[PDB]
Design a protein around this ligand. Structure first.
Ligand code: BCL
Ligand code: BCL
Ligand code: BCL
Ligand code: BCL
Ligand code: BCL
Ligand code: BCL
Ligand code: BCL
Ligand code: BCL
Ligand code: BCL
Ligand SMILES: CC(C)=CCC/C(C)=C/C=C/C(C)=C/C=C/C(C)=C/C=C/C=C(C)/C=C/C=C(C)/C=C/C1=C(C)C(=O)CCC1(C)C
Ligand SMILES: [Fe+3]
Lengths: 49, 306, 49, 47, 37, 299, 32, 26, 37, 38, 49, 49, 37, 49, 49, 38, 49, 37, 38, 37, 34
């Protein structure tokens, strides 16, 4: 039982859900990995004298 | 009584060149037309060509002399090279060394001749094609601003140094220096009016372009035909702008609106620039005396420090 | 509309009663999980004080 | 001296009122010309 | 006729109002009459 | 005599003299707005006078009224100036940070700025709805969205990125110019900012294009010509005629691009750059000319 | 400076650039 | 105790996503 | 008739509301009453 | 009929809500009542 | 306009009379509550002095 | 327009007479209230001096 | 007739309102009457 | 223009004479009130001196 | 062209003659008032000196 | 009828949600309750 | 509209009566919950003082 | 029926998503939870 | 005729008014007459 | 004929007016006559 | 659509690689290239 047969029955409409989920996951993963790498290998900014 | 084939396909002087038209292709895909087409040459335009290129040759040769005739340094410092007017001493005299303002005077004279001959070319071709001559008067209104900047303002001040120095970076420096000299043009009322008209012109251009492109499915871009009888696209545009802000125009009034915005921009700018130095030596003091300056006793200055 | 009750027959369809049941069950499960999560969050650090 | 100078009066408040009145008048007459009756293509026939 | 009545009335009224307001404001700002303190 | 749209009275196509009332009645067609698709019905789907009121029209009008009230209150009360050319509506101090307190000064600046943002977004959505009711394109919403993004960059993104929230502009007539001047001279030679120069170029080109198009269309309105005179005129001068459909496309594109580059330069100047003269110190050190000169011509 | 928030706001600005680019691409794709 | 909670919410999200996908994808 | 009832009602209501708001704001600003602290 | 009922209702509701919001905000900001931390 | 009174027949429809009555009752209740609130606030702290 | 008096027929419609009467009564009540408020405010503190 | 009644009414009413507001503002701003503190 | 006088028939309508009368009476009342106000204000504080 | 004099028939309309007379009378009265005001102002304080 | 039931439902729900969000935001910004370290 | 009461025929459809009843019940429950929340908040920290 | 079931489902789901995102953002921005450190 | 009456009248009136205003401004700005408080 | 009377009249009038204004302003700004102080 | 996925993946990979090499080089924490 579904309310959107065109989206939960056909393969072409069923592919869009996985495509969107993968897109969101890839964006989040790329952002997180880049910022983690940037903040891990950087020296301490301000050493007082 | 006007044969367009003759006006586009004559020979010799008073005729055209580049007669076999070219084709670019991508301009036809993106803009709808890609014909390079022939170009007219009729003794109003030969003079402009010769005078403009004489001025350009003078300026470029002075640029070359300023770098010791080194082509590599010529490419290095091209965008910060300039040919300045004579210094403040010997205000309006022409007995000046060539490297101390002599070349600037000659180049400016040839440029004046070139712009006047270009206006003559525009007027004559508008007359010869059968159309009106509105473009000539618009160009006149911009030449008014140009001549105030380059001729009429240095006169009545007593020196040639009140004019720009013919360079890529020299116009920006001239604008900054003129602002600093005479107080602050933010408190110049004619600067305010010019800015109002300029931003209104940009707003109107964007609105008109978007409106016509949105209704182009019904051939709304054919202005010449719509002025005879309105069509569905013009009706839709009128209804849209009536339902958005409560009033609208037809396909004939908007062009008058645009023309007058641009003309007012140029004229108010010229008047403000001329009035800046001769009558009001300090715009901020005038604004304070006119009660158009906000009190400012206790600033929070931490915003403006690094 | 055979499986729908008499009182809600004019408002619901046979293919929508099951989906409504699924939505109700999902809401209740989400509420239970939210209660658990809120209890753990309070156990971590109070927010009212 | 609670009042501005005469040059301030002219240069500021004459152009401002002129612009406001001119804008309102021009808008009114543009709307009058736009909403008048003239030749048009019939929307029922036109598509 | 060269000019119509409405144009003459409009121009005259506008000029009169503008000149009256300008003259009152100039006289008030000049501070040469002892008017309104 | 048949009256033409321009104003001519030409004695006597399928055209005819039709009052505007018939056109206005014909094209109503209610029930195609953006809110109708979402909620299944538009709560306000009628006209009040000449205006169409929709779901976002109410939001826009509420924002407008509230913003105007707050603006007048800050400037008539709490300042006691009584004139609009000396008002000075400031945000909270930079020391306060990103937080807002009603007791502290600068709260009504927050109220006015939020109300103005709501009104602007509501106006954009209303324009989208009116465009969608008439089966038109979405071009005017794109241009206005460029303008609204220019507003959001100045009042939301830059203060948040800089993190102190005192970095937004006062809403005062003749007083936002003070902020512009001080910000421009803090990063000295704001002329030398590349995107500011591109924006100025686009603004001047837009004004020139508007004047040229207005002149060209006005020069043929009331004459017996063959519609191809303008093309010959524009090919004889400058040797190119864009055409009817290209000029409006160019106008829309130039207008949008100018504001886009301007908001880019303001945001970049806020955070990633400090001095625009030091930005050009990379030029003379590139290894194609760094060793070709002597004396004052060195570097 | 927090460089994450600044980069996020820059991304929003570059997103704001997008609709004009989409209009240009649509005009190019049509009118073949 | 923050990382443990982060793992808990992430696991809950993954389980819910997988369950609903299996429900739809059948 | 030159003016309709609806136009007159709308104009009068808007003018009255704007005048009331302006008068209240000015009286509050003047600080001559010792009202609202 | 000079006006429609729905227009009257909508205009009245908008004016009332705007007035209530403005009055609450002004009274809160004036700080003359000792409400919500003085 | 069967239920609308004769005097207000040219102005009111049958289905708007009841809505108008509801609005009138709501307004009367609102003014009663507002009067009570203003009296309580004046008792707590005068705003004129 | 039978209800409108003889003199005001050319300017008034039958339905607008009632609305005009309502508006006039509202304005008169507002004027009385405004007079009372002004008298009370003057009794509180004169504003001319 | 050159001018309609509605145009005259609109022009006169707007001019009267504007002049009344301007005169009240000027008299208040002069500070020569001892009104509103 | 039955009610309009013979002298003013070419300039006035029948429905505009009444509005003109109302406007004239209002202006006369305004002039009288303005004269009284000016007299009292001069009696209070002269502005020419 | 019946109330206009014979000389001014080509220039004046039968409806604009009345308006012209009104304007002329207004200008005459204004001129007289202006002359009196100027005399009074001169007697108060000369502006030339 | 002057208004439809579903239109009233939409208007009421939206107004209530907006007012609830505004009241929570204002109470939090006041900082008078010691909520979320405030 | 067989289920609609006699007074509310011209406004309410038979299907809309049930939804109206549900909305009324939800509003009443929310009001009771809000009363309890306000009492608890007052017991925690008075806001008028 | 006054409201289609599909529309109700879509509206409820979108409202829930927006509420969850907004509440996470506000709670993480607060001084008690400093973005989970 | 080379020129219409309207053009001549309009040009003459505009020139006269502009010249009068300019001459009054230039004469009164010089401060060489002692008019209206010096 | 090569030139119309109208164009010659217009050009002569404009040139004369411009020259008169320019010469008056130049002489006044030279400050060599003791005119208007 | 296959083409959009390929284009997005290629540009994302290239941008990430270039940015990460630049960041690592500017960090000066590896003793690479002096
Ligand atoms: C720090 C700098 C100062 C400042 C100092 C000045 C000065 C100084 C001037 C202006 C002027 C202008 N200012 Mg300002 N201005 C500042 C701040 C601003 C701000 C802002 C947002 O802060 C804005 C929007 C503006 C806007 C503007 C414009 C309204 C105006 C120029 C109009 C124009 O079209 O010129 C473009 C028009 C021309 C350049 C005319 C000349 C060109 C002619 C038409 C054609 C020549 C062609 C040539 C010969 C080449 C042909 C051949 C080639 C091969 C093509 N200013 C600050 C306060 N500004 C001008 C003005 O009018 O002021 C009253 C002016 O002189
Ligand atoms: C950290 C402690 C914080 C706080 C942090 C949060 C956060 C963070 C959140 C809440 C949320 C809520 N909070 Mg809490 N909360 C606090 C204190 C309170 C107080 C109070 C007076 O003190 C109250 C009354 C509440 C009340 C509430 C509720 C309104 C709500 C949880 C129930 C709900 O909506 O269920 C109804 C909701 C559901 C049934 C949703 C169920 C979703 C399921 C799990 C599916 C997820 C998506 C799924 C994977 C998608 C699959 C298909 C795709 C196609 C792949 N909180 C304190 C200050 N609270 C949560 C919420 O839902 O807000 C809207 C939320 O996100
Ligand atoms: C500086 C030393 C003196 C002084 C020295 C002089 C001298 C010397 C003279 C004046 C003159 C004048 N002075 Mg002065 N003046 C002084 C101080 C003042 C003050 C003041 C407040 O202090 C004022 C208000 C004036 C005012 C005036 C004017 C009355 C007059 C110029 C009128 C004009 O514009 O003609 C030009 C006007 C026009 C060309 C336009 C006429 C239009 C007509 C009236 C209406 C037409 C309407 C019709 C519909 C139009 C049709 C065409 C349209 C285009 C449609 N003087 C000081 C004290 N003054 C001049 C004079 O006496 O003139 C007679 C003169 O020569
Ligand atoms: C105080 C002494 C000041 C000065 C103060 C003023 C002021 C102030 C004014 C003038 C005005 C004028 N001055 Mg003076 N003036 C000075 C010195 C001069 C000198 C001089 C050489 O010294 C000259 C030549 C003038 C010349 C002039 C005239 C141009 C003009 C008066 C005539 C006119 O046009 O009436 C024509 C005017 C009318 C026909 C007006 C009729 C108005 C009608 C009666 C309505 C009035 C308003 C009323 C409220 C309406 C109510 C009802 C509603 C309509 C329903 N002045 C000195 C320096 N002068 C007046 C003027 O009109 O300037 C434009 C003006 O306002
Ligand atoms: C405190 C003493 C202050 C002052 C403070 C104020 C304030 C404050 C106000 C006025 C207003 C007015 N003042 Mg006072 N005023 C002062 C001195 C003066 C002087 C003078 C020469 O000294 C004058 C001539 C006036 C004259 C005037 C009038 C123009 C006006 C009141 C009458 C009116 O127009 O009612 C016409 C108005 C109406 C008929 C409104 C009727 C409204 C009805 C009753 C509904 C009210 C709202 C309702 C409850 C909302 C809920 C509805 C729901 C359906 C339940 N004031 C001094 C300086 N004055 C008031 C005004 O209305 O100005 C426009 C106003 O707000
Ligand atoms: C708020 C806007 C509401 C509205 C609210 C009300 C209210 C509330 C009432 C009416 C009443 C009436 N309305 Mg209704 N009504 C509206 C829309 C309409 C529309 C329409 C749009 O078509 C119409 C035709 C009507 C028509 C009518 C009549 C059926 C009825 C009697 C009018 C009358 O004769 O009053 C003649 C009397 C007056 C005009 C009195 C005016 C009094 C003035 C305003 C002064 C009040 C002072 C105040 C009490 C002072 C308080 C002081 C402080 C306490 C200190 N209303 C809108 C939707 N209407 C009344 C009714 O139902 O009576 C049975 C009623 O009580
Ligand atoms: C604290 C003391 C403050 C002050 C604080 C406030 C505040 C705060 C408010 C007012 C408001 C008003 N004030 Mg007070 N007020 C003060 C002094 C004054 C003075 C004076 C001379 O000093 C005057 C004349 C007034 C006059 C007024 C009126 C204009 C108005 C109240 C009557 C009204 O509108 O009834 C008519 C009102 C109604 C018909 C409302 C009916 C509302 C219905 C019942 C719904 C209620 C909401 C509820 C949550 C809905 C739930 C729906 C769900 C589906 C269940 N105030 C002092 C300075 N005043 C109120 C107002 O309405 O402003 C616009 C208001 O909000
Ligand atoms: C205090 C002493 C001040 C001063 C203060 C003011 C103020 C303040 C004002 C004037 C105004 C005027 N002054 Mg004075 N005035 C002074 C000295 C002068 C001198 C002089 C040479 O000394 C002169 C010539 C004048 C001359 C004039 C006139 C131009 C004008 C009144 C005429 C008019 O139009 O009446 C006719 C007036 C009317 C027809 C108004 C009718 C209004 C109607 C009745 C509505 C009123 C509002 C009411 C609430 C409506 C309620 C119902 C609803 C609409 C339904 N004043 C000194 C310096 N003067 C008044 C004016 O009207 O300016 C335009 C004005 O406001
Ligand atoms: C902490 C003490 C604070 C304060 C904090 C708040 C806050 C915070 C809020 C209120 C709210 C309200 N406050 Mg309080 N309030 C204070 C003091 C006051 C005073 C006063 C004179 O002092 C007054 C008159 C009020 C009056 C009011 C009302 C307007 C309103 C509660 C009734 C209502 O409208 O319910 C009508 C509302 C409902 C019936 C809500 C129904 C919601 C339903 C049940 C859904 C809930 C969500 C849930 C996740 C959904 C589940 C299903 C989904 C499918 C998953 N407050 C003090 C200063 N008050 C609340 C409100 O509703 O504002 C609009 C609100 O948010
Ligand atoms: C500072 C330094 C060193 C400068 C350098 C020095 C130099 C270079 C000087 C150059 C000077 C020159 C070139 C001067 C030129 C003067 C001229 C051309 C004046 C023209 C007058 C034209 C006149 C009087 C025309 C009048 C026209 C009239 C009376 C028209 C009248 C009419 C015409 C014809 C109509 O239809 C109908 C209306 C009406 C009957 C009124
Ligand atoms: Fe066009």
């Amino acid at each position: 039982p579904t309310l959107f047969p065109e989206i939960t029955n056909t393969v072409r409409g069923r592919f869009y859900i996985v495509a969107g989920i993968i897109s969101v996951v890839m964006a989040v993963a790329s952002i997180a990995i880049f910022w983690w790498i940037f903040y891990t290998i950087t020296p301490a900014p301000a050493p007082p004298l | 009584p006007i044969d367009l084939h003759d006006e586009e396909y004559r020979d010799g002087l008073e005729g055209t060149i580049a007669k076999p038209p070219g084709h670019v292709g991508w301009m036809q895909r993106l803009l709808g037309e890609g014909q390079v087409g022939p170009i007219y040459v009729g003794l109003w335009g030969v003079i402009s060509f010769i005078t403009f290129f004489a001025s350009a040759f003078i300026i470029l040769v002075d640029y070359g002399r300023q770098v010791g005739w080194n082509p590599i340094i010529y490419l290095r410092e091209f965008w910060n090279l300039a040919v300045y007017p004579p210094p403040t001493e010997y205000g309006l005299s022409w007995n000046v060394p060539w490297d101390k303002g002599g070349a600037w005077l000659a180049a400016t004279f040839f440029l004046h001749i070139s712009v006047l001959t270009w206006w003559a070319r525009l007027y004559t071709r508008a007359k010869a094609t059968g159309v009106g001559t509105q473009l000539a008067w618009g160009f006149a209104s911009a030449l008014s601003l140009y001549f105030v900047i380059y001729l009429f303002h240095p006169l009545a001040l007593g020196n040639w140094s009140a004019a720009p120095g013919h360079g890529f970076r020299a116009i920006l420096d001239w604008t900054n220096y003129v602002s600093i000299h005479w107080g602050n043009f933010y408190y110049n009322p004619f600067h305010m009016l010019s800015i109002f008209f300029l931003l209104g012109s940009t707003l109107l251009l964007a609105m008109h372009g978007a409106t016509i492109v949105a209704t182009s499915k019904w051939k709304s871009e054919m202005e010449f035909t719509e002025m005879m009888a309105e069509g569905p696209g013009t009706q839709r545009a009128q209804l849209f702008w009536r339902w958005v802000m409560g009033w609208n125009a037809n396909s004939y009034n908007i062009h008058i609106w645009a023309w007058w915005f641009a003309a007012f921009t140029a004229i108010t700018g010229a008047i403000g620039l001329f009035l800046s130095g001769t009558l009001v030596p300090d715009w901020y003091a005038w604004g304070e005396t006119a009660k158009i300056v906000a009190p400012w006793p206790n600033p929070d200055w931490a915003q403006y420090v690094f | 509309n055979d499986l729908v009750p008499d009182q809600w027959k004019p408002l619901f369809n046979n293919a929508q009663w099951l989906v409504h049941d699924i939505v109700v069950k999902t809401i209740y499960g989400g509420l239970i999980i939210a209660v658990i999560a809120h209890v753990l969050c309070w156990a971590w650090t109070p927010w009212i004080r | 001296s609670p009042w501005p100078v005469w040059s301030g009066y002219a240069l500021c408040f004459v152009p401002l009122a002129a612009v406001i009145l001119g804008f309102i008048i021009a808008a009114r007459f543009t709307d009058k010309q736009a909403t008048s009756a003239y030749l048009r293509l019939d929307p029922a026939k036109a598509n | 006729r060269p000019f119509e009545f409405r144009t003459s009335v409009v121009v005259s009224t506008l000029l009169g109002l503008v000149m009256a307001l300008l003259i009152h404001f100039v006289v008030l700002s000049s501070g040469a009459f002892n008017w309104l303190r | 005599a048949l009256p033409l749209p321009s104003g001519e009275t030409l004695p006597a196509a399928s055209a005819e003299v039709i009052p505007f009332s018939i056109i206005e009645e014909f094209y109503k067609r209610p029930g195609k707005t953006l809110a109708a698709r979402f909620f299944g019905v538009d709560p306000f789907d009628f006209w009040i006078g000449r205006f169409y009121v929709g779901l976002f029209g109410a939001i826009s009008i509420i924002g407008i009224i509230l913003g105007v009230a707050f603006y007048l209150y800050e400037g008539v009360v709490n300042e006691g100036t009584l004139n609009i050319l000396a008002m000075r509506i400031e945000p909270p101090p930079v020391s306060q940070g990103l937080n807002v307190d009603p007791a502290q000064p600068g709260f009504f600046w927050f109220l006015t700025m939020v109300a103005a943002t709501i009104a602007f977004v509501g106006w954009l959505l209303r324009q989208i709805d009116i465009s969608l009711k008439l089966d038109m394109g979405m071009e005017v919403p794109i241009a206005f969205g460029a303008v609204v993004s220019s507003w959001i960059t100045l009042q939301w993104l830059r203060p948040i990125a800089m993190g102190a929230w005192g970095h937004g502009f006062p809403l005062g007539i003749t007083h936002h110019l003070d902020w512009v001047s001080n910000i421009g001279y803090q990063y000295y030679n704001f002329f030398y900012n590349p995107f500011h120069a591109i924006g100025i170029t686009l603004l001047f080109a837009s004004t020139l294009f508007l004047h040229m198009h207005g002149s060209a269309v006005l020069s043929e309105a009331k004459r017996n010509i063959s519609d191809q005179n303008i093309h010959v005129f524009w090919r004889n001068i400058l040797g190119y005629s864009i055409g009817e459909i290209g000029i409006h496309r160019v106008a829309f594109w130039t207008g949008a691009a100018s504001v886009l580059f301007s908001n880019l330069c303001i945001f970049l100047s806020g955070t990633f750059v400090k001095d625009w003269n030091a930005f050009w110190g990379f030029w003379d050190k590139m290894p194609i000319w760094n060793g070709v000169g002597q004396g004052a011509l060195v570097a | 400076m927090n460089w994450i928030v600044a980069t996020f706001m820059l991304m929003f600005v570059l997103v704001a650039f997008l609709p004009l680019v989409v209009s240009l691409a649509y005009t190019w794709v049509t009118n073949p | 105790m923050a990382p443990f909670l982060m793992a808990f919410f992430t696991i809950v999200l993954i389980v819910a996503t997988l369950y609903f996908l299996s429900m739809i994808m059948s």
